Amino acid sequence: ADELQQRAQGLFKPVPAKAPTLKGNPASPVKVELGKMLYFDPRLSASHLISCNTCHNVGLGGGDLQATSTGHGWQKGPRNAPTVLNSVFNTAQFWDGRAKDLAEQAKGPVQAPKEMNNTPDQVVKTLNSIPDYVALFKKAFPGEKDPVTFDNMAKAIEVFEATLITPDSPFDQYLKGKKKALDGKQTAGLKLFLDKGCVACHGGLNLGGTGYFPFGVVEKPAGRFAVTNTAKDEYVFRAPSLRNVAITYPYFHSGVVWSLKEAVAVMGSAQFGIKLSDDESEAIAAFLGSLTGKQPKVVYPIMPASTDATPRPRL
């Protein structure tokens, strides 16, 4: 019946109306602003061409519209740039890896050598080179004889991301009150997302983002990609958060599947013992579309100028 609503209210949870407090990283006005500038400063990279936003494009659903990201040197990477919208709520920091490696973790500072091509110390050199950024670190991180450190730099970055959230997606307004926030097809898709076992791995605050599982997608030797079992190789893949999934194509860790309907079709896997008909993998995908919230209103930061003591671009 409409038991479905009350049901969903217990498995899922809307995105809070406001950025969550980070532990040991008190968000404040300057801190967010400094983090903002930082997220959008290509000088955090060696070339001075790549920022975070180059690959986690707030204007484009948070990702990079690439199958796999291409960083320094025009090098094509091994992985999809996952969104940065709502990342604040995931605990599973990687796509994939050995189970014995992933096992423990977390939670560390953002590190992007390879993609940005900068050692942490070079990053700290650059920051220290620009006066305005120092005055800014002192304001954001007050008690320190030295605030200009890769940890505080990360804290500030991450406090900005805390605000990159997406409240009131139609589905969130359905979990709140409005039952006709979802439409027929979408509401049909909600039920199938549940009664086919999808919420097992894609559940909670972020519809995923929280756990590792020994299943991944590959090329079939002989519809064209399929979920494989990596239990034997002691490997695991993250079950990504499905929030805003409509706007972050292409899909999976390798970005091999561009169509959202088609990606449902792969996920309705024999390995999890789920069978989907096209109408169900249609309908579900519909509901997936209901998970697109209100995109970030961001004023492009006015970043400060390099001084004679700033390292030159190493392309």
Added chain:
Amino acid sequence: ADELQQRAQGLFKPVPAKAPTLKGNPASPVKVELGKMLYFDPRLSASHLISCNTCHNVGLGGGDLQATSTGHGWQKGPRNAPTVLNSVFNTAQFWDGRAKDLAEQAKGPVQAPKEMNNTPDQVVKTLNSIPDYVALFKKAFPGEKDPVTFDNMAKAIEVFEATLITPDSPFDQYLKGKKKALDGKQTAGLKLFLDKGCVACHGGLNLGGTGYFPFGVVEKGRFAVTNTAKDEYVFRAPSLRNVAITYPYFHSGVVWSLKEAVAVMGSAQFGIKLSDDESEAIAAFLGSLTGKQPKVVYPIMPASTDATPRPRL
């Protein structure tokens, strides 16, 4: 003595505090928004990674922090990126060419930067896949059967670039009236800038961007000016508004210091001599050319669809 002010006030002009209306390309709420998303949309490149913001960065004085530009395929360019800020005022359109080459142009191209590796066709096709964009072209150019044209899109991007201006720069304030808007060293720099003939090419509303001259900063201080009338080749005297924050300098971007570049430009060729303190004081002045950097909402850009072509890396 303080009549120096009226000498400048009759040689320059401050930046208008509201975007200028362009010839047969009127502004409007919806056209500026559309112009914006186009401007931050990387899907105008074959690669899907580069946008007019990749090289003309609102957050860094409308430039790109490089000598010369990269570049689809990570491939360097021939020219330094010039600043988007106040470009709406500059009449002189390219870094450099033969005079004849540039001559017949005014009725011609626009455009498709060969840096982005798309054709005007490929761009058009891309905007025709994204239903939301299509609607915005029809709302922006409301008469027309088919508004999604390359020219209408350059027109959209133009209208929003027109909003990228930098008023209330210390100096602009100085012209507007206030005498003390410039500190000591700046007033001495402005004095010199005139007395040395700097304002001859770097004068006007944009302090340049308005003329061409057979004069090139080339390798040789490592650097110097050269006469190219011989070859019949000419170069842009560029708008030095925001010149404190748009390094490196020159066509090739070979000089990183706003002090070195001021010294390069007190040259034998112009019949000029500058002392360290003099070149150091001119820079001081050129520092006051820096205006209110634009407050601009990062646009939210419509989803791709089945039709939208795939990236070509």
